[PDB]
Amino acid sequence: HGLLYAGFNQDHGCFACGMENGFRVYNTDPLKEKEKQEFLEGGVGHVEMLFRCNYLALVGGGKKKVMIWDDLKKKTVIEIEFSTEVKAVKLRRDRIVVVLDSMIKVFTFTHNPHQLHVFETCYNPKGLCVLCPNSNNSLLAFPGTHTGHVQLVDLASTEKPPVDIPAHEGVLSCIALNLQGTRIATASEKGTLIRIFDTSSGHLIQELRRGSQAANIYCINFNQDASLICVSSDHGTVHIFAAEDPKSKWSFSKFQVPSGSPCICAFGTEPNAVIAICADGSYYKFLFNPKGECIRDVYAQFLEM
């Protein structure tokens, strides 16, 4: 019912939703609607936040124009348009990053933006890209031209050569970055193995296995101390893994959302909480014990709030 897109912000504390009539913004935990704005530009198919601030990046129904919206002024402040379709947008205090199906372009956050860099990628219809918003780390990471490789660039020291991480041997399905910008997670289209690398050296920090049968991977996210990750896959299934204990290869906890719809995942306010936002409009909250067993469960429809 109108839901075209959903996605977490940089601290996972909020998520934004693209609607056929506009966009919505919600607090992740506890769930609370923060804003709902009508914007009849064909419906919004991608919303990017910048933490909790007044600037949001919106992609219109034609998918060929990026619009920066100031929610305090209640108007679009910047428009960038493209001949090809925009697949994703990422934001930071001093840079606007736009992802296309074959390349990525970096612009200034000025009234009239100026294109600073362009970077080539493999065919990327999923819009895979991660950008660190921290002041001391302007890292950008994207899938390279080599199928299964991830390329990393520092947007501050752009003259430094890139890091080419040979993550997988097949097409990449998902990429995720930790809250400090030091560690990057990767997954292939087979969806059997998941790999964590150091962004500043390129080395394989941990490898994890989620199953034997092939399954498409929708979302991956770390917790604040980067000690745990959560991963989402078929029929709304989510797996929770330990990242810093190499004695563990499998997930210590697993759950499925009540409707079985696919979902994105992140960790909540409590250190033992995981939050799932589902494509049917469902909100789900999962609390676990150290053995991975559920101790509390909460479910709601966030579009009806």
Partner: peptide, 22 residues
């Protein structure tokens, strides 16, 4: 540059990024 002119984190609440406070 626009966030450096008048960014405001009150729109969705909580606490500001400490880098902005710095």
């Amino acid at each position: 540059p626009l966030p450096s002119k008048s960014v405001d984190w009150t729109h969705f609440g909580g606490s500001p990024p400490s880098d902005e406070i710095r």
